[PDB]
Design a protein around this ligand. Structure first.
Ligand SMILES: [Zn+2]
Lengths: 93, 121, 99, 107, 181, 72, 193, 73, 177, 77
RNA sequence: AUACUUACCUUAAGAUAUCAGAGGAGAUCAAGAAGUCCUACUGAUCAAACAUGCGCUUCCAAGAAGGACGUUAAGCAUUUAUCAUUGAACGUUCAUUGAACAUUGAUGCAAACUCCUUGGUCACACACACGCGGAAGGCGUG
């Protein structure tokens, strides 16, 4: 399945992220819902074109394979996904 | 940088090191890797991203280089648009300290499972 | 037939039969009869060499590699001898085989 | 039948690597990954005569002061274009592929 | 079609006559407002460009008819913002500030809370706060302006030194909510 | 594997930026697991306009992003 | 804001919007690889200027194993062409022979009689041995006097196929060396079970 | 009605034409064989640099990647 | 297959999109979630630095000053007071301009929080599902409140003051109300 | 209405045999116009009566197995 | 906590060293398969962990390293601050109409101050040659 980083992207739902795209566009806004395939949907999006302008989308849906990176907020530095030793409470049967 | 990186270590051994991962654009990300995956999606804590400008690139040609850094902090970079990663700083806490820390984490985890077994009773 | 639908452990043989009697029969010929082939690559590097192995991915070991390209700015054609090479099939555009 | 296993027989061997960018890399293989993420200690890496993206990607990797001498470089598989083996090595030994042999006995 | 549907409705025409007979009657112009926007759709870029030019020119005649309206400066600048055209929204609040000869705090705090989200370039963005600060910092109920500025300069800088400067600048000023600072 | 969450945009006028400067505005008639997109009344906007026929379908490789021009 | 107020306001309190300026890469219109690609047909001269070919020798190492496998299979088929003339097999009826295998080594032939006389009178018995070791191999051929007790000895409920002859379960067949159309032994690619 | 694999099966033994991704280069030869990944093996091919022949190639192998389309002549 | 929820410490027997959405919107998940994030921050603020403090090696040390310790009950009390006060100073915002522009013609489009058009569609969409049992909007014009001082508004609130220095105020204001 | 997914739309678009302005990936790509005679899952599309027209005297091409990835966009002209 | 109701969902596969023999699965056809599979069997190589060494090698105190998402600072130099249509005057200027961040910037060159975080500010000794416990890696042995 997923692996740690896209699990983090599944964690940072509804919080102010910033995306660069491969075009150089860095969308920024609240993260409505990410998928496992890194297609991410965003709201109140403020966009920076490659030309240097800035605009405001309301409701964007950027495809995963043109994301350059994504920045989540800082606090997720401390996240239970990163805990190397948290033991599993008897998986279901 | 005289850092003397571990001659038999790969990604999982490189954890919590300060990396200098480099991309297809030629942008550099600098920060603590805290996780990777199969596709080499990295997280990068406290990350700073540096470019060279097109103009400073002329000075880079065959020296002091005005690299442009923006600060991306906790970012989570992708395995598609990267090139290669190297290691820039060793982590904060040494091998004995990391080892004792992992011991304490495991003891606390076993204890939390004992508490789950107690609440289950 | 669909790829999951083949089976486990047929799948290797079905690839090998695809190798012997498919489009691969030029790289099949080149390794068994050791004739030199001419690989054109995406970065203008013409390569004249003899083939040691094949891949599903067309990863190709090449032995006694001639390589040759074209610096167009005028033109200096530059050549390099590289004796033992392992070439990924992504760069490989067209494999031409001389008789 | 994959040939990465070939490279897996090449730990502690000294190769060069030319990348899809145009970067040339000199330094031993410590290992290689399934999808050919090749990790390389004791690199010094060079850029032949130029590509500006490659100029940036060269300088920015530290210790540039155009040979850049680096302790340890992981290289992603889809960046490795071609890889030049040492000529001392005998290909007749390595391509035998004990897995492919066993599969011939498995048939 | 909803543009022309707005035209051919008789309510708009009667109320339009009511208003254009009487400029400085605000309460007529408020019904003019409410009819245009509430009769329009949820306002996005999908709406008809004629209707959007109508709302822009409507508030422009409003704002140049009653230049001391803080809330309708904010309403035009934000409604104009939701469409997009960020550069125009900057021009709008700056037209408002130029109408208040760059004073009176409400346009400032809302322009600036807006300007946090839009403008990215730190030296300049703090310079904009500084030009704001010498005009409306000393204002008596200006606590929200400073609280904005202090939380902000805590967010972007790494050295605390720039933040201590402003803390030592606050307490001299007789603010209303001095005591939070 | 997962089909995308364009269900909110199911009938609403969207604007793809296709590829880097192509910008196509239509109504989202369909989506598959690859983000291949069926648009109705595609009207390619150059910064001049050009209409693109009744129905169209656009490759989910070429599609970079899409905005909801209609309100939700 | 999102669903709960406290940490969405205070704790997360995300990043400043980030400073933008001019990129280095190419702004989509020119992302190209190499549209000026080579025109190979010139190089058909230079291979003549390239002018032997080195021995491959690894496909030879696999081809040795493949050729040895085909040669051992052919030696098998040569043993397949090379059971009426055989003197160990008695020219009785094939339908009245019962084959036993999986036999314990120390099993005496009188015990083999004793387990087998229950159904019919036994005509003759050949337990198969090595000719160089003279260890009992572990299988034997019985002809009774009738076919019907050979068949009742083939029908196995409570009896032979599953009987514990010298603390081991044995296996009990009709003789198929003479009877069925395509039968090859273990040496010849065949054998049963 | 027809799919790329039936058209490609029926394409075998014909003077085919192949536009690569790049428009600089096109190969006119007789199609020999094709896999499920649509790799192309051909015979006595003919180059066309932006349309004009720079030579006759022989038996030739294009990867499935670089070819923009294949046509039947 | 199994989706372990690290907060809830429960499993999802087979991952799919809908059970993920329904779980991450679930109130149990949000509660344990919020507890955890608050918890990590209060741990990191509580956790003392305890640096190595590499002590250097050194006449003019003639002056000696008295330290001031406290009782363990006094320590615990003043720490509790500081905890409560940090928690206040973080949470508190400044109202004023809401209470200042109360009567305004466009107060009820601009400060009433989802009539602003910019953040406006959020608070309708950010409204939680209201499955359990049990706005001054744009309609407001000038002629709703013609004359605000007819129907008595409350006065401007008197400004707040540190209780630590509440003893040092001007006694006996000029001009009694 | 209902959903019109791309696979079913191109099949409907294949039955109707309406003309097609099909586009390509980048600046090299030449706008092909034809009639679809069939497709696959990999969007390799055999197109009939092809006319290629350069980017802004279109020349015919016959019938074509067009490769999947190079396609940007199907339209009905 | 328990009950009830609703909504959603219920299985990708395989392997965990590798090679060669000892024995087994004592191989269902007239003495025998070939192979393949297993193993507290043995032998060889490899991987991981732990321990020990290496008279291993390198780094550890007003300054040195790193940073400033700070200033001096509008320091100095350079460049740029829309298009289309119509009218008028001698390509330019002005006016009207329609369409779509920032000059105190941006870019280059530095230089200085201030500030920040880290480190064995160890033990020994303060002298005229040609030490233990730290941190990081390499090699060897078990
Ligand atoms: Zn949960």
């Amino acid at each position: 399945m997923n692996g740690i980083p896209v699990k983090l992207l599944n964690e940072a739902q509804g919080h102010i992220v910033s995306l660069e795209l491969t075009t150089g566009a860095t969308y920024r806004g609240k993260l409505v819902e990410s998928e496992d395939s890194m297609n991410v949907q965003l709201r109140d999006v403020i966009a920076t074109e490659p030309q240097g302008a800035v605009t405001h989308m309301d409701q964007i849906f950027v495809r995963g394979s043109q994301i350059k990176f994504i920045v989540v907020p800082d606090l997720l530095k401390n996240a239970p996904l990163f805990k190397k030793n948290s033991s599993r409470p008897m998986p279901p049967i | 940088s005289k850092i003397q990186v571990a001659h038999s270590s790969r990604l999982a051994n490189l954890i919590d090191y300060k990396l200098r991962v480099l991309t297809q654009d030629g942008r550099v990300y600098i920060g603590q890797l805290m996780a990777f995956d199969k596709h080499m999606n990295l997280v990068l804590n406290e990350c700073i991203e540096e470019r060279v400008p097109k103009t400073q690139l002329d000075k880079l040609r065959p020296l002091n280089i005005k690299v442009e850094k923006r600060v991306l902090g906790l970012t989570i970079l992708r395995g598609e648009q990267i090139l290669s990663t190297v290691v820039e700083d060793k982590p904060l806490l040494s091998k004995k300290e990391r080892l004792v820390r992992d011991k304490k984490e495991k003891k606390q985890a076993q204890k939390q499972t004992k508490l789950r077994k107690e609440k289950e009773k | 037939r669909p790829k999951h639908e083949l089976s486990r452990a047929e799948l290797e043989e079905l690839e090998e039969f695809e190798f012997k009697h498919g489009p691969m029969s030029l790289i099949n010929d080149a390794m068994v009869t050791r004739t030199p082939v001419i690989i054109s690559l995406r970065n203008n590097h013409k390569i004249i060499a003899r083939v040691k192995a094949f891949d599903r991915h067309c990863n190709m070991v090449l032995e006694n590699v001639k390589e040759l390209w074209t610096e167009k700015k005028n033109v200096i054609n530059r050549e390099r001898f590289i004796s033992k090479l392992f070439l990924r099939g992504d760069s490989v555009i067209v494999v031409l085989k001389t008789p | 039948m994959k040939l990465v296993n070939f490279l897996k027989k090449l730990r502690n061997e000294q190769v060069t690597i030319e990348l899809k960018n145009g970067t040339t890399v000199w330094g031993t293989l410590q290992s290689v990954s399934p999808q050919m993420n090749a990790i390389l200690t004791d690199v010094k890496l060079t850029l032949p005569q130029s590509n500006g993206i490659a100029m940036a990607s060269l300088y920015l990797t530290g210790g540039q002061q155009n040979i850049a001498s680096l302790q340890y470089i992981n290289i992603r598989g889809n960046t490795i274009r071609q890889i030049i083996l040492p000529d001392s090595l005998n290909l007749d030994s390595l391509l035998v592929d004990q897995k492919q042999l066993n599969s011939l006995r498995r048939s | 079609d909803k543009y022309t549907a707005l035209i051919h409705d008789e309510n708009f025409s009667t109320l339009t006559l009511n208003v254009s007979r009487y400029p400085k009657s605000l309460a007529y112009w408020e019904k003019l407002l409410n009819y245009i926007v509430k009769a329009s759709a949820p306002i996005c870029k999908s709406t008809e460009p004629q209707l959007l030019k109508l709302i822009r020119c409507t508030y422009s005649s409003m704002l140049n008819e009653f230049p001391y309206l803080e809330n309708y400066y904010i309403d035009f600048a934000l409604l104009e913002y939701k469409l997009g055209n960020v550069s125009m929204s900057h021009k709008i609040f700056q037209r408002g500030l130029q109408a208040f000869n760059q004073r009176s705090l409400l346009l400032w705090t809302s322009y600036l809370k807006f300007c946090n989200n839009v403008i990215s370039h730190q030296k300049q963005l703090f310079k904009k706060y500084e030009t704001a600060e010498e005009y409306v910092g000393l204002h008596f109920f200006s606590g929200e302006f400073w609280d904005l500025y202090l939380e902000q300069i805590s967010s972007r800088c790494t050295s605390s030194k720039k933040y201590w400067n402003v803390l030592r600048k606050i307490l001299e000023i007789p603010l209303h909510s001095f005591s939070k600072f | 594997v997962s089909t995308p969450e364009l269900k909110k945009y199911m009938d609403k006028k969207i604007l793809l930026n296709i590829n880097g400067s192509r910008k196509v505005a239509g109504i989202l008639r369909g989506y598959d697991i690859f983000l291949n997109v069926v648009l109705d009344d595609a009207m390619e906007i150059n910064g001049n306009n050009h209409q693109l026929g009744l129905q169209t379908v656009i490759r989910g490789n070429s599609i970079i992003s899409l905005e909801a021009l209609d309100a939700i | 804001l999102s669903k709960y107020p406290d940490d969405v306001s205070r704790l997360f309190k995300p990043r400043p919007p980030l400073s933008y300026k001019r990129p280095t890469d190419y702004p989509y219109a020119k992302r190209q690889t190499n549209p000026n690609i080579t025109g190979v047909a010139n190089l058909l001269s230079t291979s003549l200027k390239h002018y032997x070919x080195x021995x491959x020798x690894x496909x030879x190492x696999x081809x040795x194993x493949x050729x040895x496998x085909x040669x051992x299979x052919x030696x098998x088929x040569x043993x397949x062409x090379x059971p009426n003339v055989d003197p160990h097999i008695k020219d009785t009826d094939p339908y009245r022979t019962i084959f036993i295998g999986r036999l314990p080594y120390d099993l005496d032939e009188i015990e083999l009689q004793k387990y087998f006389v229950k159904f019919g009178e036994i005509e003759k018995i050949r337990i198969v041995k090595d000719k160089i070791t003279q260890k009992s191999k572990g299988y034997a051929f019985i002809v009774f006097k009738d076919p019907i007790s050979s068949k009742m000895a083939f029908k196995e409920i409570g009896v032979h196929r599953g009987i514990q002859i010298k603390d081991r379960i044995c296996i009990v067949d009709i003789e198929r060396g003479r009877t069925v159309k395509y039968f090859k032994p273990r040496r010849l690619g065949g054998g049963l079970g | 009605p027809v799919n790329p694999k039936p058209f490609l099966k029926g394409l075998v033994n014909h003077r085919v034409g192949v536009k690569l991704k790049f428009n600089s280069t096109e190969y006119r030869g007789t199609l020999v064989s094709t896999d499920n990944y649509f790799n192309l093996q051909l015979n006595e091919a003919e180059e066309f640099v932006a349309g004009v022949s720079h030579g006759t190639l022989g038996e030739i192998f294009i990867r499935c990647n670089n070819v923009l389309y294949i046509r039947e002549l | 297959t199994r989706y372990y929820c690290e907060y809830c410490h429960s499993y999802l027997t087979h991952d799919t999109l809908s059970v993920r959405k329904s779980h991450l919107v679930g109130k149990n998940h949000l509660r344990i979630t919020a507890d955890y994030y608050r918890n990590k921050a209060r741990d990191i603020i509580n956790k003392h630095n305890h640096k190595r403090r590499h002590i250097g090696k050194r006449s003019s040390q003639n002056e000696t000053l008295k330290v001031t310790c406290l009782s363990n009950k006094e320590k615990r009390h003043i720490m509790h007071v500081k905890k409560m006060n940090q928690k206040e100073l973080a949470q508190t915002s400044i109202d004023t301009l809401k209470l200042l522009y109360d009567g305004s013609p466009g107060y009820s489009k601009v400060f009433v929080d989802a009539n602003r058009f910019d953040i406006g569609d959020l608070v309708k969409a950010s409204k939680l599902p209201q499955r359990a049992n049990e706005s001054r909007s744009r309609d407001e014009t000038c002629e709703s409140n013609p004359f605000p001082r007819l129907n008595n508004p409350k006065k401007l609130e008197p400004p707040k003051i540190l209780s630590q220095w509440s003893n040092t105020i001007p006694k006996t204001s000029i001009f009694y109300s | 209405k209902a959903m019109v997914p791309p696979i079913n739309c191109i099949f409907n678009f294949l039955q109707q045999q309406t003309p097609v302005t099909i586009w390509l990936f980048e600046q090299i790509g030449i706008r092909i116009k034809g009639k679809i005679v069939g497709f696959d899952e990999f969007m390799n599309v055999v197109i009939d009566e092809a006319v290629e027209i350069p980017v802004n005297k279109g020349t015919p091409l016959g019938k074509i197995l067009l490769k999947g990835d190079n396609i940007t966009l199907i339209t009905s002209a």
